């Protein structure tokens, strides 16, 4: 769905970075660097995406990409 396709976006801009080393499998925070607007962002656009102020307790799950999917897909499956 236009969910995951998206969802790669999302972290691509509200990490803030290009739209093609957006894997599905990588620790942007550490990885990459998002220790700024890595969730304070990410929440509000997967949050506006559907709706799941994704807690930084769960965030630390989503450190990457890949579970920010699976994590919105994992909710309405």
């Given amino acids: 769905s236009t969910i995951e396709e998206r969802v790669k ?3 691509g801009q509200q990490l803030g970075v290009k739209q093609e080393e957006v894997t599905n499998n990588a620790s ?3 990885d990459l660097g998002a220790d700024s607007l890595d969730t304070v ?5 997967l949050e506006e995406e559907f709706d ?3 807690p930084d307790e769960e ?3 989503i ?3 890949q579970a ?3 994590y919105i897909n ?3 499956a």
């Fill in 52 to 54: 799941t102020e994704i």
């Fill in 28 to 30: 942007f925070v550490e």
């Fill in 9 to 11: 976006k999302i972290i």
């Fill in 59 to 61: 965030a630390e799950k």
């Fill in 74 to 76: 994992g909710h309405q």
């Fill in 68 to 70: 920010a999917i699976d």
């Fill in 41 to 45: 962002e990410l929440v509000m656009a």
């Fill in 63 to 65: 450190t990457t990409v």
